[PDB]
Amino acid sequence: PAVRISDGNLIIKNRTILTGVPDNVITTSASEAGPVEGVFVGAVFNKEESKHIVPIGTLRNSRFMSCFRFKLWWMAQRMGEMGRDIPYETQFLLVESNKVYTVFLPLIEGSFRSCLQGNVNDEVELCLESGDVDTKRSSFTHSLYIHAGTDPFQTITDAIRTVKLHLNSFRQRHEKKLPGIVDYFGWCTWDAFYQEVTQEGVEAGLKSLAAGGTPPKFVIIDDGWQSVERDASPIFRLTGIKENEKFKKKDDPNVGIKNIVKIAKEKHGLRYVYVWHAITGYWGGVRPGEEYGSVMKYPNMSKGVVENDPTWKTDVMTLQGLGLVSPKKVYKFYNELHSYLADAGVDGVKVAVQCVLETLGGGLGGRVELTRQFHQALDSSVAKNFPDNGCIACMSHNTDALYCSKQAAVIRASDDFYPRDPVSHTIHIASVAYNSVFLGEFMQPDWDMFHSVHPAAEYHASARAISGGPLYVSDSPGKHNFELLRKLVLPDGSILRARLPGRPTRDCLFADPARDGVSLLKIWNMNKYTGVLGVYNCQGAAWSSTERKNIFHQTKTDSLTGSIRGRDVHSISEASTDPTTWNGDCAVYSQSRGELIVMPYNVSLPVSLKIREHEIFTVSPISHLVDGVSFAPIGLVNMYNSGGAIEGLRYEAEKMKVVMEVKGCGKFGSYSSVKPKRCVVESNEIAFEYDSSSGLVTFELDKMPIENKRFHLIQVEL
Ligand SMILES: OC[C@H]1O[C@H](OC[C@@H]2O[C@H](O[C@]3(CO)O[C@H](CO)[C@H](O)[C@@H]3O)[C@H](O)[C@@H](O)[C@@H]2O)[C@@H](O)[C@H](O)[C@@H]1O
């Protein structure tokens, strides 16, 4: 077929990937769909137990990259050559045999959830768990899926499709409705006030940002608005669905969060208002009580999580427990909550603490069946009450939840932005890129909030710009960098969102740019008519396998050199108006240096960077109109994702004309191999500059497109 087991070996296009597959491991190419290009894998065991480890075979001398849970809530990256290097809790694994790429998807099957892990003998072990000592099983047929192909990202997509067609319990990213917040700049209260947020806090924040010319059009009222109590650092539990004191106008206390929602929308011009809540109500769940059938439960410890995060064994939540709402009443709980919120004008929720459900499998059906039931009810309640699909999933990097991700369309792709922890910044940019390789198959990644005023602001902000996801800050009011923010946000609060999850280049997939001391991390994305490439140095910090937390670690040179090729933007062909006849030549524009460079296909351009430095490049395919006349739009050169502005593009070779639809305002740049005769913006000739040495054509779009008539129409005549 292409992937087979014969002898005791796993073979993929005649390369031996695994040796010593034990005889009880069985393959099958049947879903109901039904023949299938890769292979499903499970095993038969002697006894009917609620857990199994089972070697799959022995990995040696094949580069792999993995996404593995280093906390319960979150994944990050790990590269190796050998089985022993594969961490506990590995949820996805990609393997390069050297040309050919292979993906391993441990899956949910019935009431069980797989992940991978390695042992010291270099075996890849599958780990099946029901997370409920009463749900037990002896055989498994479809608990890992393996599939190969020649394009690493296409390989991943095809494999997720195939898993989707087996399970029918989720939708791929591209098939879900994104909520409208992804198109606008936002503000999150969380880093501004933490749990001490108030409604006066909210207003001040929306005011200062609008003052500086970059207005948020959404806001996330983060953890802090809910009514909660300790029992009587002890844990808080939800006492009501309605807002605490800080969100009732100080005058008519019967008016609640409706007040701040109105202030934000009518007074400060926001389109969307989102609020935070745990999947379980609050951190300690809901106060035990017959209303929602709430009952104290204690997180069960699974071996792999505890192995990577030892501190989870003594977390507030583990030791003090949570009031878990009953599955029978969980819809009721979310509907009552969300109906209150929505009928107050709230458009969406940011749903945190999602992974706990896996630990509360209790006597309730297990990790998979309880995660399902809660997610089914959350969705129903979201589709009823926030029907722009206003769900942001946070702290949910388990396959329990990803494989029943049917509706929700936006996922935080890492652990939090930490303004005060200097260790975190490089790790953030790496965890976000690597997890988006796999998380972006399901939901649109969210690179999380950041500070415009921070030593690492431009580092974080460039990443946000090229992430594909919502762009927001969590600034405290008045502490803003609007020179910075205008590179991301147009006068009306819109952004230049790229189309895909921001991901590492083919080049970077198997080299760990946090740990190897040698490579720069290159992130790629696409717009309609350009690509875009971020280059970062994210070296010298990472999750330690020994210390089991984020540490700094030693780094040899200060400055690393890599290189950039147009083809590093993996899908750059899609931006060409004529892919059949395109030679591969790209206009590359260094957004930070201000320089335009023509890059023939093949040709490299070196890039040097110290730790925490970055460079963003817009990559536009060059169109050859006639011999000597070549063109490629850049977009808005003083914005990070400059190419996000070009909504339309057409070449008229017969008349020597480029016609463009450009959104936004500010300086517009293009590469032209000859000086233009004219540039025209809405039927009016305009002033432009040309640098004959580089090709750079430049003029000013002075104002936002007028109307109600969304784009500037620009003709360039050559
Ligand atoms: O609480 C609001 C915040 O929750 C989401 O997750 C934060 C999570 O909490 C843990 O971080 C710490 C540990 O003490 O708890 C608070 C956050 O409540 C601190 O900021 C600490 O860093 C945990 O270690 C984290 O891994 C976890 O992400 C977060 O996604 C949202 O930002 C939300 O505002």
Numbering used by the authors: 5 to 102, 120 to 253, 264 to 749
Study authors write:
The alkaline α-galactosidase AtAkαGal3 from Arabidopsis thaliana catalyzes the hydrolysis of α-d-galactose from galacto-oligosaccharides under alkaline conditions. Here, thin-layer chromatography is used to demonstrate that AtAkαGal3 exhibits a dual function and is capable of synthesizing stachyose using raffinose, instead of galactinol, as the galactose donor. The structure of AtAkαGal3 comprises three domains: an N-terminal domain with 13 antiparallel β-strands, a catalytic domain with an (α/β)8-barrel fold and a C-terminal domain composed of β-sheets that form two Greek-key motifs. A sequence comparison of AtAkαGal3 with acidic α-galactosidases further confirmed that Asp383 and Asp447 are presumably critical residues that serve as the nucleophile and the catalytic acid/base, respectively.
The crystal structure of D383A in complex with raffinose was determined at a resolution of 2.47 Å. Lys75, Tyr78, Asp446 and Tyr449 help to stabilize the glucose moiety of the raffinose substrate at the +1 subsite. The NE1 group of Trp78 and OD1 of Asp446 form hydrogen bonds to O4 of the hydroxyl group with distances of 3.08 and 3.47 Å, respectively. NZ of the Lys75 side chain stabilizes O3 of the hydroxyl group through a hydrogen bond with a distance of 3.54 Å. Tyr449 stabilizes the glucose at the +1 subsite and the fructose moiety at the +2 subsite of raffinose via hydrogen bonds from its side-chain OH group to the O3 hydroxyl groups of both galactose and fructose with distances of 3.52 Å. One water molecule that forms a hydrogen bond (distance of 2.70 Å) to the side chain of Asp447 seems to be involved in stabilization of the fructose moiety through weak hydrogen bonding. The interactions of the residues at the −1 subsite with the galactosyl moiety of raffinose are similar to those with the galactosyl moiety of galactinol bound in the D383A complex. Our crystal structures of wild-type AtAkαGal3 and its D383A mutant in complex with galactose and with hydrolyzed raffinose, i.e. galactose and sucrose, reveal one water molecule at the conserved position near the anomeric C atom and Asp447. This water is replaced by O4 of galactose in the +1 subsite of raffinose and stachyose in the complexes of D383A with raffinose and stachyose.
